[model samples]
Target chain A: KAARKSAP
Target chain B: SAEWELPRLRTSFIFQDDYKYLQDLAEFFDVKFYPYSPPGAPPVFAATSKKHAVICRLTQTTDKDANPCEIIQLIRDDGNEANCASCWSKDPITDQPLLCIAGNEGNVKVYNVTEGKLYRTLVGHGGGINDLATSPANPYIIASASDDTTIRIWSLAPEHEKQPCVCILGGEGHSYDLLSVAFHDNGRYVLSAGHDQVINLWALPEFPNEHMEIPIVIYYPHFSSSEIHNNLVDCVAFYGDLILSRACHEDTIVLWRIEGFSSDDPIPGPLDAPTPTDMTKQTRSYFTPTVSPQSRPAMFTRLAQFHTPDCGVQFFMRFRMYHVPGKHPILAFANAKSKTFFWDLARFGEYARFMADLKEAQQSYNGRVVVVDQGISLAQAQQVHGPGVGVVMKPAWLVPKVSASPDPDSPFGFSRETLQAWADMYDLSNPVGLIKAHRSLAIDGAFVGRQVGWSPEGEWCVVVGNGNRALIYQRWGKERG
Candidate 1:
């Protein structure tokens, strides 16, 4: 699964 | 320093070390001998934290000639005491526990500072505690590596029920004797490397009477090639997204990168030049853009390469981290000669090949050999890179799934100050002792061992070693005018 870029 | 972090808030001042000619260094010597400090204002301290140090020379006895091995000297950073958690407690109390290895007795003895009393025959490791690492994540936990095929964890806290936290057996990894040990950022993993030709990674927080977990997930292929000089693996280091290992005889450094699992194509080809953009562009919508597929998150990946040294370097130790969790991603390595070599993974392959070439050139010098004999040689090398470019996502579980309202003590609710404070508290500067020196003295050499670690903020360093037994150095000395 592609890990989403967490909101900074 | 976050526990006391907010005491100094948003104040910027001028940097003194970079002003040229106002450089200041305080030297601590056992025999009142004078030595020059490094050009940069990198703060350093001794391993034993003793005001005075003595080294064991190969041919002399101190009783007649006052000649000590000069071997127990190791270097650590005393960056800034104000930021460390234990500085307040250490600076005030002198009667904790201070001991040095006495070669005459072949065991470590405690020398009381108050009564000026010396006790011989105090036993722990039969050979000696060759290397020690104090935990940055947890205050009271201490780890010591020995030649006795064991590594022991001890607690300095007074209220602790268990005196010895845990002891890790060498197992098959014990073949060459455990040389060095390092704890992971989570305080849950430990890495040990030595003559066994393997880098052993073990799970931490191990309980008593249970089989220990050994994670040797990373290793290099045995070489039959002419360049593969198979010597005892002397030191190991972990930084940013890389792990570095150095061996004896091969003055060459082996570099590895964490190959993230993300399969997205890189913006620039492995060795391709980056595209230029208009410096004046202000908004994301202002410039015409080429649409591309969304990139995936980068996971931990691995790759290996080599770094040759400048001399017929027997064994190189003293591995320190420059950039760990905060800023510039760099690590520095120093050898016996004046030259201090560096490995920068940020620049990838080109920088590695460039430093290898410099190493090739430095080895031709007849002067370095002479300086080694005189014991005053000075050489230093460094690796550089652009600012960090990747972003990592925080897991949702790490954050509290709430209904928009922010809670002060929320598991996932942390401010920038909270994050920065946590990062500052971690001691990523893991300094290791060279095996040859440790085996020869059976103790640590505080003098030649300078820790080259830099905090992620790149503004300061997390210093380790020098008794009160455990303290960290901070580079807050550099402030912009």
Candidate 2:
């Protein structure tokens, strides 16, 4: 699973 | 929220209320409190939803009220942009769209959508104005599909702009009534559907002239049973080269690929061959009923049959696709139950499986946590001490801590990391610029609004929303360090 990152 | 809000916008943000009062807030169980004074202080209840903000954050907000619907809907919609001067300042929302009063010996009136006030009264179709499509590219233009056997284009920009911009007439044209009208993504063309069992595609010229001609390209041939669905082509949408039409019936989404237009090709495929070139092309004669490929083009049915639990009837199967976050297309649809459904158009059938797995995993983890918390479920604990028990439960009089979570160094969630980094880097005191405006409102109550679309440059946006009218606003990136 990928870690959460800043979307913008 | 404005001061803190704009601070976030200038630096890290390319950012982006109602009040109901009284009697409902009376505290129960306190018999003396018949009319309990509503607590003006905002309550800070926290639960699983707030876990991120403590250690990480998720999304941004404009703090007027903290109702859950407001939070979720704002996350789903709302936008920001810079206002411009020149020919682009802004337009106002003047009138609520007029509808033909069925059974009215008939009349029409301009009503305000937000405040429901009537402005000017005009005579509408004696039958009914069934549907309307606002131009995606032009904020002032509006197209209406009506039972008057005609589709009318009106300019809400000027009050004296009374005549329809272009009307589709001819009994063989729409037959019964026009049900749906849609503007092309590029705003150069329009697609209208109707009871006549045809899809008429019309082109809008860049420059209007005295001798301009309105052309029609009928994309589909008539299907038998004018009574069953004879008068209904509920909606239409353009996906690349394919044009989809939904009729008023079960399992009635009809798809037609535009074969004649070499300029536009759909990324999706048709179950059958593309509609014959003759039928889909613009020509002089009104289309005569035919039985060839041009008339009955093949359609590909989606794997999932949309059904509803309550009505047991799949009613509005409207779908919209947007290219958000790169070429990744987001598909949004209303299911049989009228609940919205989101799908990654790329994944197709996997949406259901992915959501099912996510929901199950979330539930199991929460259930296990409940079993371990001294026989107390999260719900029960929340009932007694509010949701603010994530860090630790507060005693009745003690105020909860308001410290920034996780020291702001470790990796943060998308929404939070961006906000914190922005807060640290830029001065949020100044406002970003605005782009353009379209028109003024006819009624005094309405004002121009903006709906932000895709931003090409970081911190910029091309927005579309209804204000005094539906207009597009652009936000250009400012040179700031």
Candidate 3:
């Protein structure tokens, strides 16, 4: 899974 | 005589030494900025917590106004998010420079520093990671400490396929969250410590060919002890076989070695000398039994302790240790308040010379190596040398962390009023056996962050933490490109 960017 | 005077804080301060071992390093850049957020979004790091550090590559530059440190995308977090630990290395197979950062989100992201983007994420950690380190022996190898109370080793090369986690280390050895982990320069061993106050020395697994299929689980450490630090441990580093460890409450950073685990300084023998085997037979219930057959035989012995005045707070203020062959090792501690303190290893009581001094203590006090643990319990040694500090244990030479000021009235102004506080803390009345810093400049930042580290080439240092800002200190008068 692509870890989400630190902030949405 | 005026040439020997200290340089003021905001200016370059050259370390005073005859033919300096480490080149003169002064603060060259104090790069500060709020991490990139969506346009018009309010920044969240000013009040947030966790030992977050900014990891970057300092590009070669001479233009005084330019920013040499290139911060990776999203790795410097904002809001409640934080990057707990990070390290600089390269993909062993591709030779692409990589930055592995452990995040509070429970995964370690591999960033291609050259490409300046996220390469991929190494997942499977149950909780957030507290610290991670790349093996010096192999750039591809890594070990991470986590809130899950275990340490996992990974092979980041493509040869390992999608499954990078090679071995999972945990079990009875660690009962609480693990905070710090470091590989021996040889890379065959790992030293880790955490909230349980246990300092565990583990023999690393030989990366088996079937690692991706059958990741090994280490049930116990090669050696373990809760006898050293008083409270939770946040940092544990290696200076060859000797260990440098710190806790929130311990006023000192301890340098120690585990008995039998080390070869050069084999635990001395004979009937008169206290051996681990002899101690095991009489050790009480205070320290539980370790590995079978010869259980509870190993002991953690203090070689020396470096006094750090104001690091006793609960915050995770990490320290850095730099050493090369035949040269004095340099230690830099991040003082959360103002200045960063440095110490050279040659001054931290030599192991061989300390042994010679022990022989004299043996004759004078009928004891050798300031005994603690089993020969049973600390009581036997507490009356004489004590648990926290031993009468026979050597104290590292130190210089109080200080900086110069422009005001003629303040002269060598050491953080002003608080300077006297530490002077009274470590007793500044007598300044004997104090060795100076490898480099002598202190950055005048309002908040001094949590991480203090130097570049691999020993050319630049990057300080990062709570402020969402970073400072780069570069060495001067050196001839390396």
Candidate 4:
């Protein structure tokens, strides 16, 4: 699974 | 002196009254309200098409009162009751029969011909009760259902496929909990599901002749512990063009998501071709590089923005809907736990994206640079390797939240009264404007009270169930009754 990225 | 005193009195009178604001809002939007509840049961779900609309009850009852619209009884008055019933529309141009799909508590999805007032089909696949269901906008014969068993099943209503209606199932490894909501993209190629696990999973429909489908390639987890999107259940989800909107039960926020490398016609890349870790040199590439292993199939998502409640702690029980006005910017509407409905203008959403882009550009121009470090170089005989540094220090900006500002004095969220007032002043068509607040409480209970909303295909009329004993219909102003 991909790492969770913060919102932009 | 006398004129000033009169102006002050008028301002004070308007500020203290809630009824005046509601009236002003109704007038501004030119909305018509029709509240109704079924005779024996509370109306839980509703759906509308170009010509007709339908409503469903939470509990099974043979009672069907004569109303201006059509009403069909799906289940008998037995002890079994339906929970979280959902309704949708699928039009058939050939038969002139606009089908209404209703999900029931017995894990059954019943399709009814609204024009003929007859049950068309009963799709049975899920083990638990069906929470929500959606019909493909592109293909009226295709339907998708989300169940409490943490699975989503796709069914076909074509005449030839009577024996094998269930075409595909999306579940198994990605979701660890039950799903509550499911929606199909207007293109009818992609499906989205979210539920108790607090994650939004996106899957691509397989091509024909495939028995089983692969797992989701895009898994969106919108929580970061401190800066979480929803601290509770993600109740409902919907799609507005390329944008994906989701709301939570206890959390007062509507998060917007966009697929990073989405294209309508492009074939979904295989699991081995999922996006990999970003590198500065490969940032401009159109497609993700093929993965060398199966563990790297999950692709990242971009959270475009978040719409928060002006007053925190209020919940959104159902998924939000998007309506496209003929000449105006599309509007996003949702109801809170307190029964009040709010609408957000998406025209200014593009402007907000521009604002973020400007901020990021300014920040990068101010401090972005590269630093090079060399170690263990031989002084006597050394060849100097000239190249760019190993590190690029300016991380991309990821900003979120506090998008909504209230004019009320009692509003919370640590937003200063002055800041709130300033933000409201700057609101216009070019910026995100929180407009049209119907202060009337539509439903009390957030869970079993089954409140559903549907917009006409033309976006001229909106029908909401569980507003009262009748369906609340909101129409455009001066557009005729």
Candidate 5:
């Protein structure tokens, strides 16, 4: 899965 | 910050979890690396495993006038590098036991701690050696990786010193400079890789007590491939028969194994991993498969991936693997963001998802991401959505501690959905979603994590580099001794 920046 | 203390802080030392929450029974120590020069060459890397009783340390310096006799050159594995050689007589330089430190000066210096001075040296490689490892099969037997594109097998035991380095391994297995080298945990094979982006596995020859190196094309790679990873692979390690590797620009740590070899036959458990003696025994295989790599050349298949998102720099952040006997393994690596990420296989849905992804990768040549709640989940999906579309991979970051004992309740033995709820019962602050752009800072200044290490017995875990200091932790929990 191409990982994404989940809101920190 | 008050939670962490200097010399020998016990498990409760985390200070009511006010600072941070680590696994139970943890002790902390700051092995302050006092470099020789004021603006000393900080460590670029550290060895994966401990040798004799020596801890981890390594550096790459450009200066040719660097003194070989410096404190950073050697340190104890646990705390006493002298205990193993039984020479408490400390070195005049650091007032400590200094055995053999791979002094990046293109030579491996052999310092006899007992003799209280320099012993001898293994000076062969034409270029600066990257690093070295003592064999699991024979601690006295050593192997070194070099920039000259060769891995030299050497010795520390008395008799073999007549010719320090035993044999030299090089071939189409690798071209260009080498950066990493590791011994198989079982003590049977050697793994080497670097600039060429190729992972080469060599099946060591059976030695008869006093065997010497023959100058010829004798030992060749039983397995070699460069497909699993795209950039220059910096790290390669053995997990039983499984392997894990990382390369720059790839942004992922990939788990893989040789295409033709099946580790499942079970290596006959060595009564001891390396119990061979001079002119006598070889590491006895009790449960492992009987192998003959003499005529075998094979490829490796990618099994799964572990994500290291936002790793600002990616040159030499060597993640460590922590596994004690009778338990699942754990992986640890720190990022440039001053936060360390651990991938604990025993965590909720961790091992389960790992297995699932492994199956997915094994089943298809063009592997896809393992869809599960274990990795970084996004609301707005990426990729041109279609019927059963795919991406490279999506793995989570969670690591566990190591000490000799078994987890009675392992997430590996249950359902992913059920374990998700189980993991949910506990907040992410404890052992999940570690970094949130919040959390306590691991270091005060800009920290670029480098060499990571776990002790042989799996009791001590140390992470070093760019920080100029080493954070050493011990398993001092309730059930732990």
Candidate 6:
């Protein structure tokens, strides 16, 4: 799965 | 809308908390951190997902004279050479072995099996030195290499194709100059290439063509007019979802193009009976060339936006990556030739485009309310409102150390006891506003000029490559501050 950047 | 003045800036800001220093990998020719989770590995900030393995391309010269250059690799995890570009292929779907692909002046590609700690395979085909290499995330067997020979060769690493390495060749007819970079769409069906030629070509991979004959495929050129796109050499190109982002080394502009009609499932155009003409005269008449007018280009692609850097200085060839933040807009971050790193909001870009379109429509109408506004508040009020934000510059921080001392010898650049006391009297790091201004003004070691910057897929850290042998990793600290 692609790594997801969490919302700031 | 007034409510957005403060909240929008607040919501969009990025903060820098702490940093991780890797001393061994200093002066790295090129560096790439693994972006995927390894098999049977837990998800942790620094340990999980191939974090320990930092792939770097190193170089050495036997003598400064005519002697051939020797490239080396210093693998911190396995302990590496090549001088050009390096990419991590941990997302390979086929093999249990995590792979790293490095390309260099040898005009060859070396694939290392990170799990086994040995060289896995050597890919060779290009006549000129390879400039860059990229592996497909969806299919581990497929790898693409960009070369100084002005071609992008796609190789299938599947066992069946052991003898014949090159699966497809991209640039004999499309790009006249050396190709610098290559990237695959997430789906792995289409490939993007850009180079010294001021054009970006989007090629479609056809299914099952006769292996002997080089398949004649279609090529799309996104930029038509010099005024609309980059007039100089296109240094680097990347894919953000379906969008194509390209940068020119001489110009301080990044152009964004959207792929409109492309689908991985769509049938690739049948191979042409004759090879497409590569001559400039023939290319102008080709249907794929977007003419003097923007609308003349094929419907499959369209230019969406052009981002101009605040500083118009010449920029080095650098890679820019897209960071997707949940519940918020995606952003594009890159380190330029200048000392500053920039992050641009894609969603705000869309908003800005819409604003331009509306403003144009309003101006065209006969009966319209137009106000000649003063330019001062837009600058002053915007500055005060945005925290001197360069469109909301994210993440201010305390400076880190470089191996070398400050280049400024005037009045003793060191922060000695006397200097520290003077600075302490004039400014305090404890004061929030003072800290912000201090970080901006303070000089950091190493050429503050950033040559390259890559954002990890998880967005937990950002790796900025500067003059030092070190990789300055900025870890994301929570929003408490």
Which candidate number maximizes TM-score?
3
**Candidate 5 ranges with C-alpha deviation above 4 Å:** A1-8, B1-98, B114-116, B211-219, B263-298, B348-442, B456-459, B474-481
Over the stretch B1-481, how does candidate 1's per-residue lDDT look in tens digits? Answer: 3211111111111112211221122221011111112334322222222222222112212243232123333222222211111110011134333333222111333343224345222244544344455555553345555656555554444433333344443343345555556665555445566655455444453343423343122121111011122556656655422456666665545544323211132222211211113434211111122443525222222244333343243432445655434333444443433333333334333323332433343344311211111112222111111122111122211221101114555322234554333222221222221111100111123222223333334433222222211112222332333
RMSD of each: 23.9, 21.2, 15.8, 17.7, 16.9, 16.1
lDDT (C-alpha, whole model) for all candidates: 0.33, 0.32, 0.55, 0.33, 0.48, 0.34
Instruction: Give the alpha carbon lDDT tens digit for every residue of B1-481 in model 3.
Output: 1211211221122212221121121111111122223433322111112322233334555555555545343233333434556665676667755667665678887777555577778888899888888887887888999989999998877767668888888666788888889898877778888888877777665786543775677766666677777688878888877788887755567777665455343222212222234334322222232664655454655765666654435346677765645344567665555556666555424433443454465555433234221213435455754433333443333223432233544322223444343333333223221222334455565444466655444445555543344445555412233
Clashing pairs in 3: none
Q: Candidate 1: where are CA atoms >4 Å away?
A: A1-8, B1-44, B47-123, B159-162, B206-229, B257-302, B306-308, B311-313, B343-481
TM-scores of the candidates are: 0.41, 0.40, 0.62, 0.51, 0.56, 0.53
Q: How do the residues B276-338 of candidate 6 rate in per-residue lDDT, one tens digit apiece?
A: 344433222122434446664442333333332322332323445544444232222333322
Q: Which regions of candidate 3 are displaced past 4 Å?
A: A1-8, B1-80, B263-298, B348-449, B478-481
Ranking by DockQ: 3, 5, 4, 6, 2, 1
Restricted to chain B, the TM-score per model reads 0.42, 0.40, 0.63, 0.51, 0.57, 0.53
TM-score, chain A, per candidate?
Answer: 0.41, 0.48, 0.30, 0.48, 0.47, 0.49
Model 2 regions lying over 4 Å from their true place: A1-8, B1-65, B68-124, B157-164, B169-171, B204-232, B252-255, B262-317, B323-327, B348-481
Q: What DockQ results do all the predictions give, each relative to the true complex?
A: 0.01, 0.01, 0.03, 0.03, 0.03, 0.02
Alpha carbon deviation, residue B400, candidate 2 (Å): 43
* Model 4 per-residue lDDT tens digits across residues A1-8: 12111110
Better of 1 and 3 by lDDT: 3
TM-score of 4: 0.51
Better of 1 and 2 by lDDT: 1
Which residue pairs does candidate 6 place in steric collision?
B14-B395, B26-B469, B26-B470, B27-B469, B72-B81, B73-B80, B73-B81, B74-B80, B75-B80
Instruction: In angstroms, give how far residue B203 of model 6 lies from its true place.
Output: 3.4
